[PDB]
Every structure is written in structure tokens, then in C-alpha cells.
Write a protein that binds this ligand. Sequence first.
Ligand SMILES: CC(C)(Cc1ccc2ccccc2c1)NC[C@@H](O)COc1cccc(Cl)c1C#N
Ligand SMILES: CC(C)(Cc1ccc2ccccc2c1)NC[C@@H](O)COc1cccc(Cl)c1C#N
Ligand SMILES: *[C@@H]1O[C@H](CO)[C@@H](O[C@@H]2O[C@H](CO)[C@@H](O)[C@H](O)[C@H]2NC(C)=O)[C@H](O)[C@H]1NC(C)=O
Ligand SMILES: N[C@@H](Cc1c[nH]c2ccccc12)C(=O)O
Ligand SMILES: N[C@@H](Cc1c[nH]c2ccccc12)C(=O)O
Ligand SMILES: *[C@@H]1O[C@H](CO)[C@@H](O)[C@H](O)[C@H]1NC(C)=O
Ligand SMILES: *[C@@H]1O[C@H](CO)[C@@H](O)[C@H](O)[C@H]1NC(C)=O
Ligand SMILES: *[C@@H]1O[C@H](CO)[C@@H](O)[C@H](O)[C@H]1NC(C)=O
Ligand SMILES: *[C@@H]1O[C@H](CO)[C@@H](O)[C@H](O)[C@H]1NC(C)=O
Ligand SMILES: *[C@@H]1O[C@H](CO)[C@@H](O)[C@H](O)[C@H]1NC(C)=O
Ligand SMILES: *[C@@H]1O[C@H](CO)[C@@H](O)[C@H](O)[C@H]1NC(C)=O
Ligand SMILES: *[C@@H]1O[C@H](CO)[C@@H](O)[C@H](O)[C@H]1NC(C)=O
Ligand SMILES: *[C@@H]1O[C@H](CO)[C@@H](O)[C@H](O)[C@H]1NC(C)=O
Ligand SMILES: *[C@@H]1O[C@H](CO)[C@@H](O)[C@H](O)[C@H]1NC(C)=O
Ligand SMILES: [Ca+2]
Ligand SMILES: [Ca+2]
Ligand SMILES: [Ca+2]
Ligand SMILES: [Ca+2]
Lengths: 812, 810
Amino acid sequence: YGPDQRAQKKGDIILGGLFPIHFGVAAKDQDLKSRPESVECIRYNFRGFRWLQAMIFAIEEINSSPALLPNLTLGYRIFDTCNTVSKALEATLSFVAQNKIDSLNLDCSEHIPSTIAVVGATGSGVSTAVANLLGLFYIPQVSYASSSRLLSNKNQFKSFLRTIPNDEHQATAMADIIEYFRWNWVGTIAADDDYGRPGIEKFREEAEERDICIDFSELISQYSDEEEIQHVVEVIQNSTAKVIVVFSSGPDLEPLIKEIVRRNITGKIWLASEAWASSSLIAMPQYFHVVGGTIGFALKAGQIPGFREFLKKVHPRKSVHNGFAKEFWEETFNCHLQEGFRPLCTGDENISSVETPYIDYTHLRISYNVYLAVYSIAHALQDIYTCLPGRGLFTNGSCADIKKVEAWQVLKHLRHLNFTNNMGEQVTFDECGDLVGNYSIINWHLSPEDGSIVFKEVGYYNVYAKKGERLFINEEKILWSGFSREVPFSNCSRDCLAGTRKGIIEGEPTCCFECVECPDGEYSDETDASACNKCPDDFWSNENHTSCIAKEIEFLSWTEPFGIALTLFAVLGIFLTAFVLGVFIKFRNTPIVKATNRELSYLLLFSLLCCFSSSLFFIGEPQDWTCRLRQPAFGISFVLCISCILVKTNRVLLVFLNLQFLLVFLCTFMQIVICVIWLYTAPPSSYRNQELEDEIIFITCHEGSLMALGFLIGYTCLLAAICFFFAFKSRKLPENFNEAKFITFSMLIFFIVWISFIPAYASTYGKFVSAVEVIAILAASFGLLACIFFNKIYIILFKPSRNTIEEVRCST
Amino acid sequence: YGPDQRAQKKGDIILGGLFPIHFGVAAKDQDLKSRPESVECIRYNFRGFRWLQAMIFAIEEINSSPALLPNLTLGYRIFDTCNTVSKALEATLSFVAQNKIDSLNLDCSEHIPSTIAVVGATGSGVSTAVANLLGLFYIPQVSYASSSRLLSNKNQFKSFLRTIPNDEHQATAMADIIEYFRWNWVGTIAADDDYGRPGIEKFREEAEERDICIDFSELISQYSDEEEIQHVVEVIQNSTAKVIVVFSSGPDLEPLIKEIVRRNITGKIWLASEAWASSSLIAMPQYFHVVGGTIGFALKAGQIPGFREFLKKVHPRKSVHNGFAKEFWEETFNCHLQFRPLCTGDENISSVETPYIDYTHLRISYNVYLAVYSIAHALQDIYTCLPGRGLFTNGSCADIKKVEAWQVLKHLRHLNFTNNMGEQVTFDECGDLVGNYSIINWHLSPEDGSIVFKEVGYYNVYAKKGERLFINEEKILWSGFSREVPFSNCSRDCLAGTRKGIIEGEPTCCFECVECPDGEYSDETDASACNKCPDDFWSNENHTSCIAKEIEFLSWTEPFGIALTLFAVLGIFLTAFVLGVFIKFRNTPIVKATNRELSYLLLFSLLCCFSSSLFFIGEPQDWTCRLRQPAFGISFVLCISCILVKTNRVLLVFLNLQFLLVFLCTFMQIVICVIWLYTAPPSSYRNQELEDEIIFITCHEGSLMALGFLIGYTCLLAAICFFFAFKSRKLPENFNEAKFITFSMLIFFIVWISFIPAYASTYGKFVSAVEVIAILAASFGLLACIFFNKIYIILFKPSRNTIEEVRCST
Ligand SMILES: CC(C)(Cc1ccc2ccccc2c1)NC[C@@H](O)COc1cccc(Cl)c1C#N
Ligand SMILES: CC(C)(Cc1ccc2ccccc2c1)NC[C@@H](O)COc1cccc(Cl)c1C#N
Ligand SMILES: *[C@@H]1O[C@H](CO)[C@@H](O[C@@H]2O[C@H](CO)[C@@H](O)[C@H](O)[C@H]2NC(C)=O)[C@H](O)[C@H]1NC(C)=O
Ligand SMILES: N[C@@H](Cc1c[nH]c2ccccc12)C(=O)O
Ligand SMILES: N[C@@H](Cc1c[nH]c2ccccc12)C(=O)O
Ligand SMILES: *[C@@H]1O[C@H](CO)[C@@H](O)[C@H](O)[C@H]1NC(C)=O
Ligand SMILES: *[C@@H]1O[C@H](CO)[C@@H](O)[C@H](O)[C@H]1NC(C)=O
Ligand SMILES: *[C@@H]1O[C@H](CO)[C@@H](O)[C@H](O)[C@H]1NC(C)=O
Ligand SMILES: *[C@@H]1O[C@H](CO)[C@@H](O)[C@H](O)[C@H]1NC(C)=O
Ligand SMILES: *[C@@H]1O[C@H](CO)[C@@H](O)[C@H](O)[C@H]1NC(C)=O
Ligand SMILES: *[C@@H]1O[C@H](CO)[C@@H](O)[C@H](O)[C@H]1NC(C)=O
Ligand SMILES: *[C@@H]1O[C@H](CO)[C@@H](O)[C@H](O)[C@H]1NC(C)=O
Ligand SMILES: *[C@@H]1O[C@H](CO)[C@@H](O)[C@H](O)[C@H]1NC(C)=O
Ligand SMILES: *[C@@H]1O[C@H](CO)[C@@H](O)[C@H](O)[C@H]1NC(C)=O
Ligand SMILES: [Ca+2]
Ligand SMILES: [Ca+2]
Ligand SMILES: [Ca+2]
Ligand SMILES: [Ca+2]
């Protein structure tokens, strides 16, 4: 009536199931020279047998309780799929044998039992192929471990339900894990089925959202040959990425793991999915120098309060409704049962003496899914049983009949299901028939007692919280590759420090770059800069281009000690001129003072008080008003002083008011008219220039027109030359204590100071070019004050005042 | 047993058939006392009807010929799938009904026929679901239009064969088309099934190798609701990529196309796969402002001779074995068979424009023809087997009257036949067939206003990589117009003055051009690193290419240097005239009155003084700048020391002593010029620090103390002579010589004082222009004062009486 090896028991209501008792089929090649024969399944799976026992224990538990489904019993027909689509299709063609006869009008035993619900398959290709056929007859299929997203399409899979979350949240969780430890450079490996490809595509979308670069991406399989495995290992070994993300199962990853262990490749960081993070085919001590320190996902554990004793009650003779117990007994103890080199089995053997994954578990993660997968169908049937007329889920509020139940009525009550389990948590299904739950994050260690691999919990993924606040990882429990508390470095290129930029594009992806220094006018202080940023105006870049600092303004100042030293030599001149004026005003109507002109000497001593005070326009910060008055002050004061010297000597002044006060006004007026035309045609101005150096701003003054500056100096030098020539011709003539000799000396000192000044102006730098124009004024101003006046002051004031000051003297 | 309407004919060997007579099914989802019923198909498909008629015509043509399978007949049973997996599984269960009883031991009618082979489905999900159920019983399945790569796995699909190539070459061809027209910013759209998804993953894998950046990737479906369509359209119209690559079919693309038409989105470039490049659902003229100008692939054509005449003979009452003809006659003429009027039987098939009779090429109908003939040649190879040469265990043949499905599968695995067009047909180890592609482009007809597909190229799968694609650019209208090739790059290419230089958290295809700073350049049209311009060169103005620098010095061939050279040669040629008059007119009282031998040592020092100015003209070198200053120093101290001991007033009374006072005064400067050059020598120096455009060649003088000593000693010896000669200006002796000595020593100081501003006021190339005139003025002033008045008296008219020993004494 189907497959030979089966577990079945009769009752009023039949359920079906499909479990992996073997890992696969025998690898043989069909040459088709003869009739094809049925294939054999090779490797025994003990986890699958425990999952099968979960169904039987749940069904018997419901059969023993009068709270759930009174006066009604359950049966089962359970087969083996061997992780192959063909054997699953052979079993599910037996599930639909009665339903298909009525649809094909084939009209032969007529005693075929009916299946109203199936606890579905493990893999996601097997489940799709089963659901394709079960959807024709609306038979519900409650899978416990199929987690592909493609089964959430309710246009194609009308009657599919599951008790496991799908793989969108796990891909997003791996993206959060990679983003958490600050990595960019990864690689991906997938199985070539319906479980690997959507997980890798969702992870690729999530990683491309968060700027994570993928180096290599490969597909592997259980039946891939040797050349493909060698090519994948060459792809892995040619890469600098340490972090590798795997969506695969155990049987699909075991060839690649064995090949990587054979070449002994150490130092990779494996990120595991739910299928192989707890797999005993890969969690072996022999491989721990390759796969140590693996970080992986797990489901949430469950409590079945009587299950281990039921596992221990197994026996190959007392299990008459289980056809799978005999081979479990043979593979567990390595012997042979006599059919009613391997020795003969006896019934007196102990389950606890052999370490197999049948009772070596510490948690229940998929067996709890099988437990709820039976209890959901049981509460759907109970919801059918307890209905009151007029309040059903049908047209007129009518109710289905518990004596005559059809599969689509159970499907309709499974679409509206809300029941509380043994822990007090509520179980419902979505509009896509899904169920949601948390994840655990575990890490592979090495036991110090027996050397096996221990899965220690390091964190959780809480699916109910807001986006960005879901992952929790404790870093103090992670051992990277079984040791090495340092977090490993797994991004492409090392970061550029301050004063550099990411700079050069290469043709590689964005994660790989270089480091280039900034120019000499800009600043950059950040890790991984893409450009260099310009300083604001009147700022210049700091050394190493980390920050930007201010700029220094250079001018002659009032408070620096050189300016303080130059102010006192211009104050001393004023208080020496105001002493000569004091002696001249107090000691008037005396022969020396009255012998020459008294009124011209007052106008000469006022012009000297203007010549000393005209040097203070060259000290300080230049502005507009102190550069439009800087040159006319010197010009007018010196032409007034030189005119008063020239017109006073009286030898060729009156013999060739007064006629001598009118030769001063014209000579100063011809300079005033120049200084008015200059300021009303082309005025001087200030300037803040930055062109000599990039770190010093100089404050200088533009003089405007140079012709009006040439006239200003040429007229003064012309008048001093006329005075020098007219005073040189009277040096021997003694009159007023040999005055023309001292006038000649003063006009010589004026030209000596000018000729000494004209080298020094064109050879100095800023803040020192306004330092020569003060000493050039404060040398001529004492040279025109000493020679004319100090000899007469000595005769008037000191001891020659007894006899030398008289009208008899100062005549020869 | 099975579906209601079918096309069925009895024979000795029965073949199956699965064709899409309809496009899809309706939507009904509720379970309120349903006992849910059969789903209805909606839209009629005439192209699928033509494919079904191709299979029927091939079977009838095989049965008419005595040269292929004699004394035997072929039958058929053909169903409809409506592009649905469930509707195909209902028929496939009817196909395997006899074999299924034996496996389950279900045991009854016994009249169930046995199907030998199935002509497979169109879609790549429907074919997978059929192949899963058909591989149990080893019934072969030959598909005419499924092209997914997932069907090439022979561990899972043990009995599946194809007559259409898979989609590796199509995705590689799309990558070659994109690389040919030089784009790097595209987008992708794929159908959400077993057709679109591996093809778009293969295209992504090929496009990462060729440096093509993808902007967006989205998935569509036939039964998508409204919100997904609005989201996909909003993804499309935020992108700057004009090139969109679609890998889907007609019914899955139609809702998105309708939504893009209603929002009037224009300007995009569509790249079509084989499925919708000839689809009439998308190629409506009302959509031409959106999808006009599409570039797509197409298969290779075929020839079936009497096929149109077979198509023109369909009739609802003369087709007794084809139960699909009644709905065809209703849908073609919009009438009703016994508000739609009542049909008569006499309507004309050529009066209605449908895709049934208007095709102009056969592509998939030839695939159905080749499928049926492949099965027939496998049966003929079974039939003509010689005993002892079989393909079975002991070399034994099969039996044609008791044939089974696995025997036909074994023979189809070893099939090699020739078709009506003269080629060879065989399947490889994955049951795959290899073929070329044609590349077509959508135009608008100027007569009917419809859409015309014009061949612009071919893709050749038998050539070496990089030599497969052929495209004729002269035949492409890029949107129904616009012969210019469009632009799809993320950023425009940089120029030679700039560099490709930013990173934004954006893909490598997107950048911006940063201009090179003053001093750098590039010289390529896409440069990832701006280059520093080489040494002694500088950027021009736009940093697109840089030019050399200008070296600044006073030169021999510039006219100013020529003028200085002439003014220095005139002094030598005037000194050699005074020396000629002094040598010819010797033992005469003017020449003999002073020291004659000491006046020959002064006209040599003047010849050295004029020639010492030629070290300041030209390019500075190491030897010129090491002899530039000592030559001036020794020549001027010799020329001043020969004047100092010549006046004779305080020289011999305060060739015995004059030469021994010349020698010490020149030796005291020779020792300085030896210590300076053997302790701290001067050197040449090229400097670029003043300006970035001009290099200056100047000279470092080394120590400044040994430079100050020369000038100080020279001015000291010129001041002592001035003081000693000023005190004798009135004394008349040898024609008032001390007055002229005073004038010469005054002119020397005037030239020095005039020189000292101009050295510190000039720039480069003019600072060596003042040091020549300052030497050529002192050298003329130390000659004109001394050696002209005497020459005038000796040579010209005062030679009669003034030159005598009675004169030149007072
Ligand atoms: C104040 C002053 C007029 C300089 C000055 C000072 C004191 C002096 C004492 C006696 C006599 C002339 C004197 C000139 N400001 C002008 C300055 O900007 C620029 O000056 C020059 C710059 C170049 C060449 C010459 Cl030829 C001069 C002068 N001259
Ligand atoms: C050739 C020379 C010695 C300049 C020279 C030329 C002709 C001259 C004629 C008469 C007398 C002295 C003369 C000096 N090269 C020196 C030059 O580099 C630098 O010179 C100076 C630079 C700054 C200050 C002074 Cl004080 C001098 C001089 N001096
Ligand atoms: C768009 O970008 C592509 C590549 O990103 C540019 O194609 C390059 O053009 C230069 C100039 O002849 C060639 O040297 C390169 O070999 C081309 N690249 C490739 C990959 O072939 C194309 O020119 C750009 N189009 C623009 C800027 O209009
Ligand atoms: N859900 C996985 C299968 C799976 C989950 N947990 C497992 C444990 C063991 C083996 C397989 C599994 C899939 O879709 O393919
Ligand atoms: N190649 C398509 C099938 C196909 C080819 N041409 C078509 C024309 C119309 C519809 C479907 C098709 C597939 O694999 O799915
Ligand atoms: C790359 O690695 C560095 C450590 O070298 C780390 O600080 C950084 O966050 C990583 N990720 C980036 C740049 O995205
Ligand atoms: C890996 O690198 C080696 C270099 O020795 C090369 O030969 C090989 O083809 C590479 N494999 C890849 C890129 O898959
Ligand atoms: C393999 O790699 C491990 C890692 O350190 C090393 O200890 C060992 O020596 C290597 N070789 C073998 C043969 O195990
Ligand atoms: C299930 O029932 C509980 C209690 O009646 C209710 O609080 C909860 O919202 C229900 N769940 C759903 C999905 O309706
Ligand atoms: C998931 O985890 C969070 C916090 O760890 C917890 O509050 C929540 O109850 C968990 N979910 C379930 C269904 O227990
Ligand atoms: C597209 O543009 C709209 C309008 O600005 C914007 O709201 C949306 O976020 C953009 N992106 C996508 C993916 O739709
Ligand atoms: C669509 O837009 C184009 C220009 O963008 C315009 O010519 C055309 O008429 C539009 N079609 C409509 C509004 O139907
Ligand atoms: C198929 O038949 C042709 C015709 O003789 C022959 O040339 C060819 O070698 C055969 N085999 C293959 C694999 O094409
Ligand atoms: C395929 O394309 C090439 C290029 O034109 C051509 O030579 C060849 O004949 C075509 N057909 C076949 C069957 O190879
Ligand atoms: Ca009970
Ligand atoms: Ca690359
Ligand atoms: Ca025949
Ligand atoms: Ca991005």
C-alpha cells in the first residue's frame, strides 16, 4: 500500500508525517541497460528518529487525556524521505490515494483510509514538491523545519503552514552582526537549493544597504564533484577576506569542510545558519583546528515534561507499531537480529551505554516544533468538536460534523487558530501561515573534560523590538578560533589617519583605497577623509594640516620696546626746543637776541617743534588719515624751517611788515599748493597685503601718484641746496659769532643724513622700513637745532655772559 | 478519466501534450462551506493553439509516410495547463495512472492506455513540477520552450530533455551588448519564478566582471497587487539609469507596463529576453511612446512546408479529435455555437487579424516539430535494431510491440538524427540543444501603425569569447527616432586638467572631477591620480599640460649686453692709443718729466680695469663667480697705488721706492684674495623661490667679511690719495696734476655713492647691469682726468712751444 518500512497505528482519525531517518540515497549511476530498481538509503540519522518519536509521544499523550478530543482516537502513517524528493513523492502519492480516485473517475479495494493532515518535511525543496501535490486536495501540511521564503506565496501553496520562522530575519541579523564588529570585507557560500539562494540574496540586499563589500560568492552541493570543490577552495584561498557567511546544511557542507581540513586552512571566521550550527557532522573534534570559534544561530528551546523516559523505553520487540526500531537497534549496538562481521543482538542491552545523538541532547528545538505541529491539528479538531449551531465558520453559521470530517474544514479552522501551549504562550498563524520567535546566538568552544565541542550562548536576537535595537552580544564570552580574545581585523584596507585622505580610486570596489596627503593651504582632522577642506580667510593651515590657525599682522607698534625707545628721542627734542625758547623769551632785549631778528627765531623754533612732532605719524598701525598726512607734515615743516634759515642771514636778503617775512610765506605756500593738489587729485591710502608671505599680513600705505611725491622732496632739497650755496660763500666773514659756518655745517648734516638714508630704505623688510624714516627725521632735526642755537645759548647762559654779550662784541 | 476538454486520438503508441491554450486563471479565495471547486481560465491564446496544431500536424505527417515507422500508428492525448502548476499536475496524474497502480499495489479497469513520452510545458516552474512526478516512472519529457538552468541537473530530473538552449548564453550576450555601447549605470527587473531569478543572477555575475554598476534590482509577478507596482515604479523614477534589463515574460510584465504607460514615463532603454521580445501583450501600439525602440533576442527560424494550409482547415464540425476548435471558432468571430449572435459554419479564417495566422516566422512551432520527430526517430532506432548490436545488457534489442518508457529514454540519450533543413540534432549529457540568437529592434510601421521587428544583429555561440556578437548600428532607431546613441553613465568623464577623485559612500562608477592645484596636471580623459608636473617645469593655466620654465640672466646676445661689450671694448682701444703715443713720443720732457716706467704700469692696470667688467656679463658659473670680485679688487688697488706714489711731493721726500710701495699695497690684497678662496669660496646657485615661473641663476659670495675687506681697503687707499692730493691743488707742477688727481678721486666716490642705491633697488637680470656701468664709469674717470690734457699738449697744436723743459716747472 506504499513504502514497506513505516510506522502506523489505526484509529478514528489518521494523521500523516514525513521525517528524515537517513541522510541520503546511494550514489549510483543508472546506465539503463536493464530495468531500473529502487535505491537504497545509506547513513542512519538519530536526530531524525528522535523527531519521529516526538510525534508518537504527542499523539499518545492526546489519546490519554479526556480534556482534548473525548471519545475519539488518533492514528498515524509515518514514512521516511531520505532527504530526497522521489521517496517523499512516493509517500505522498499514498497519502492522496482515496482523494485522487474520486477526481479521476477510476471507480478498487474501497477500504482506503483518509489522511486529513500531514506534519510536513524538513528541507525546503521536499516541502515544495509535497505541497504542490497536497494543494490539489486542500490537505493541510504543517511543516516543522522548512523555512524558505518561497513557501510564503499563498497563490501557489494554498494549504501550507509552519511552526518555524522564515529566513528574512536571520539574514538581517547576520547583517547586524557584521555591522556590529565593524567589518567590510566578507565572502559568502550557499547551498544550491531553495534554502541557500534566497538567504544569500536577502543577505546581499541587506549588506549592500549598509556599505559592506562582498569579495566572493559560490554555490555548493552534496553531489558536487571534486573539480568544483577544488575550484571553490582556490577561490577561498585567493582572497584576503577572513569572514565567511554560510547558508547550507550539514550534508551540503561536509565535502567542502573535509577538503578545507585536508589542506589545513586556519584563520577564517565562519558565520553559520540555523541548519548547520548544531550539526554533528561538522561539530567534530578533528575539525576544530579549522572550524573553531564559529558564531551561529539557534532556535528557542522547549519543555516536553515526559519525553526522555519515553525515549529510553524503546525496544526492538515491544515496538510493534514502529517499523524503524529494528534498524535503530542494529546501528546503535552494531549487531544483527535473527529474522523471525556482525554478532547476534540480544534483547538485554542498555540504551545509555552508547553515545549517540538520540539521548545526548541538552535542549529541544525542532522536537518542540513537532510537538506544537501535532497540537495545532488537535486543537483545530477540538474547535470543530465544541461548536454550537448558528456560530460556525461557514455560510449560515453552520457547523461541520465530527463524525464526517473533510480536510478543507480542518484547513479552515487552522486558518483561524489561537491556542495557548504548555508554557502559557499563544500560538497563532499569520495571513501567510507563519509563526514568529526569537533567536539565540551561540559560539563553538572546546570541552576541557572529553574534548568535544560545546555550544555556549553569547547573545540573542529579539525579533519583537524596533529596527536597530534587536541584537544583543556579550563580547567577554567569545573565543575567536577557540582562543584569541582580540577581535580580528577583516576589512580590506587600513584607515588613513589625520592629515591624509582616501584619495585614489583604483578600479577595485569602494572598500579598497589608498592614503594621500593634503595640500599646503587646507586642513583635515578625521579618520577616512575623502577631501581636504580650505581654511577661512585670514587663516593659514597648521603644520601637519590637522587644524587651521590665525595669521600674524606685522607693523611698527607703540608698545614694543623699539617704539618706546623711539618715542623718547622725539619727546626729548620737544623739551630741548622748549628750553631754547624759554631762554630766548626770558633773556630778550639783550644784544645777542636783539642783534638778529627776534621774530624770525620764534618762527624757527615753532617749526622745529613741528619737525620733531612730524615723526610720530610713522609710528603705529597705518590707517587712512595717518597716511594722507604723513608726507605733507614733513614737507611743510621742513620747507618752513629751511626758509627761516635761508632768509635770516641778512647778507643777501635785504641788500639784494617786513620784506623778510614775505620770503617765507611764498616758499611755504608753493609747497601747500602741491600738498592740496596731491590730496585732491590722487590721495594716498592704506593696504593690507599678503603677497610676500602666506603667514604674515603686512599693513603698508600706497602713496598714489609718484610725481607729487617727487616734487615734495625735490623742492625741499632745492631750497636746502640754495641755502648751502649762499652760506658757503660767507664762512670766513665774522658776524654774529661766525653764523654762516654753523649754517653751512647744518646744511651739510642734512645732506649727509639724506645720502645715508637712501641706501637703508631699499634694503630693509617690513616693520623696519618705518624704522629708518624716524631716525632720518630725528637726525636732521637735531642737526638743524644744535649748530644754530647751542653756541649762542652757551654765551647767553653760562660764564661767558660776563663780557662776551655786549653791543661792542658780535660786530666783528 | 482526466480533464474535460482535450485533443485525443487513438493509436498504437500514445504521446502526451501540455500546451498553454489560456493565459491564466481567475482569483477566488474563500472556504465558507466551499467544498472548493474547479478554477476557470480566462484569456484565449492563439499562439499556443498554433503550437498544438504543430504537434498534431507533425504526428499526421509521420503517420502518412511509410519511410518512418512502417506498419505502426501514433496517437496522442493533449491537455491544457493555463500557465498553472495545479492544472498541469491534474493532467500529469492522468498520464502516469497505469504505472501508479503497480507501485502502490492498488490493483480496476485494465483498459488504461500507456503514455510513452510527453511534449513538455512552456514555463520553467510548470516543467519542474511535471518533471518531478514524471521522473519516478522514467517517462521521458521533451520541452520546447523551458530554458532555465535548474533543469540541467540530472541528479534530480532524470528523464528531462530540451530542444531550446538555456539562459547562460543569453545573459552573457546581454553583458556583451551593454559593454559594446559603453554604459556603466543600469538597472534590472526579473520575474519572480524559476525563469527570471537564475538568469538575473547570471547577468549580475557576468556584469561584475566587466565593471558595470547596477542601480536597482526589483522583482515583479503576474499576481502582484497595487502597492508593489507603485513601489517598483517609484524605484524606477528616482534613477538616472536609462538602461533597464528585463528578464521576464509577457503576462508577468503587463501590469507594470500598463502602470508606466498611465504615468507617461519616457526616455528609457529596454533590454528584452527571448520571452517578451516578440510578445503581443506588450507590443501594443498604444504603449509605443513607452516601449518603442526595444532591443531584444529571438531564436532561429524554421521551415514547415504544408503548415499554413493545415492551419487554414480548422472547423468546429470537421475537427472531431480536436475539442479545442469550438472555443477557437467562438473567440475568433465573437459568436455563439449551438450579445453574441449565433454562428453559421461558413465564416472565413482570413477575415480576422489574430496571431494564429499572422506570424511571418516559426520559432517555437519548429521546436514542437523537432520534439515529435525526435521521439519518432528514437522509436525508429528501436524498430531497426539488429540482434547482437543493442544498447542493453548482453547487446540485446528491445521489442517494438512491447516497448516501455525507459527503453525510449535510453534511446533518446543516444540519439543523433538529421532534420528536414539538413542539420544534425542530438542532445548532450544534460539533454541540451545549442543554438544561435538573432537581435531585433522595434520599429513603427508607416502603413498600419503597428510594431515591426527588424533584425539588427546576431549572437553566435560557436565562436571564441569576445568574437560572438554582431550589431549593425546603422539600422537602430533608439526610441523610434534619435539616431544618436543615448547616455547612461553615473558621472561624466573628467578632462585633462582634473582628476577623478572623490568617494561619497557611493559605487565606484560615481565620482566627481577635482581640479588639480597650481603646479600639477593630468593628460588622460579619465585619470584617477593627478600628477605633479616634472622638475623645472610648471602648469600652464588650465593644468591640462605643463610647460617649461624660463631661466633669467644677463646674456651676450641680448642687445643690452652687446652695448655693454662695445662700451668695454672702446675703453681698451682708447687705452692702447694713450700707450701708443707714450711709447712713440718718449724721451720728450712731458713723458720724461714724471716716472716713465711707473706710467707704463698704470696703462696696464687700466687695461685690466676695463677687462674686469666682462666677468659680470653672461651666465654665472663656478669659475666666473670665483674670479669676479678679486679681479676688480687687484686691478683697482694696482691702479690707485700707481697714482698714490706718482705725485712725488710726499713720496720720496717723506725705480727704488715707488715700485716697492706699489708691490706691498697690491700684495696686501692678494693675500686676502688667497685666504678667501682657500677658506670660504663663492659658488653658483640656481634658485626658484621668488617666482614659480622663472629660475634665477645668481651666486653666493660665501663669507661676507672677506667681501667687506676688499671694498674697505680699496676705499681706504682711494681716500688717503684724495686727502694727500687735496692739499696740493694750488701748487702748479707738471701742468697742475694734483687738481686732476683730486677730480678723479672725487669721481670715484660719486660713482660709488650713486651705485649703492641702485644695487639694492633692482631685480634679477638688472642687478648685474649696474655693476658693469659702475666699473665703466670709474675706469673712464680715472683715465680722462690723468691722460688727456697731457696727450692734448703732446699731440695737437700746443706741441710747438708748450712741451719744453723750460715749461712744466711752474
Ligand atoms: C619721509 C620721506 C620723505 C623720507 C625722508 C626722510 C628724511 C629725510 C631727510 C632729509 C632729506 C630727505 C628725507 C626723506 N618719505 C619718502 C619715502 O617714502 C621714499 O623715499 C625715497 C625712495 C626712493 C628714492 C628716494 Cl630719492 C627716496 C627719498 N627721499
Ligand atoms: C663689484 C662690486 C665690488 C660692486 C662695486 C662696483 C663698482 C665700484 C666702484 C667704486 C667703488 C666700489 C664699487 C663697488 N661688487 C659688490 C656687490 O656684490 C655688493 O656691494 C654692496 C652691497 C651692499 C652694500 C655695499 Cl656698501 C656694497 C658695496 N660696495
Ligand atoms: C561611460 O563610461 C564608460 C566606462 O565606464 C566609458 O567607456 C570608456 O571609454 C574610454 C575612452 O575611449 C575607453 O578607453 C575605455 O576603455 C572605456 N571603458 C570600457 C570599460 O570599455 C565611456 O566613454 C563613458 N561615456 C561617456 C563619458 O559618455
Ligand atoms: N530549515 C532548513 C532545514 C533545517 C533546519 N534545521 C535543521 C536541522 C537539521 C537538518 C536540517 C535543518 C531548510 O529550509 O532547509
Ligand atoms: N523561455 C520561456 C518560455 C517562453 C518562450 N517563448 C515564450 C513566449 C510566450 C510565453 C512564454 C515563452 C521560459 O522558460 O519560461
Ligand atoms: C575598518 O577597519 C577599521 C580598523 O582597522 C575600523 O576602525 C573601521 O570601523 C572599519 N570599517 C569601516 C571603515 O567601515
Ligand atoms: C587562484 O590563484 C592562482 C595563482 O597561483 C591561480 O592559478 C588560480 O587560477 C586562482 N583561482 C581562482 C581565481 O579561482
Ligand atoms: C595544521 O595547522 C595547525 C594549526 O596551528 C598546526 O598546529 C599543525 O601543525 C598543522 N599541520 C598538521 C599536519 O596538523
Ligand atoms: C488570541 O486570544 C487572546 C485571548 O483571547 C487575545 O488576547 C489575542 O489577541 C488573540 N490573538 C489573535 C492573533 O487574535
Ligand atoms: C524574545 O526576547 C525578548 C527579550 O529577550 C523577550 O522579552 C520576549 O518575550 C521573547 N519572545 C518570546 C516569544 O518569548
Ligand atoms: C523615490 O521618490 C519618492 C518621491 O520623492 C520618495 O518618497 C522615495 O523614497 C524614493 N525612493 C523609493 C525607493 O521609492
Ligand atoms: C506623454 O508625454 C509626451 C511627452 O513627454 C507627450 O508628447 C504625449 O502627448 C503624452 N501622452 C499623453 C499625455 O497621453
Ligand atoms: C552524428 O551523426 C553525424 C552524421 O554522420 C556524424 O558526423 C557525427 O559524428 C555524429 N555524432 C555527433 C556527436 O554529432
Ligand atoms: C550560427 O551563426 C554563425 C554566424 O553567422 C553562422 O556561421 C552559423 O551558420 C549559424 N548557424 C549554425 C547552425 O551554426
Ligand atoms: Ca483523548
Ligand atoms: Ca573588478
Ligand atoms: Ca509511418
Ligand atoms: Ca549605497
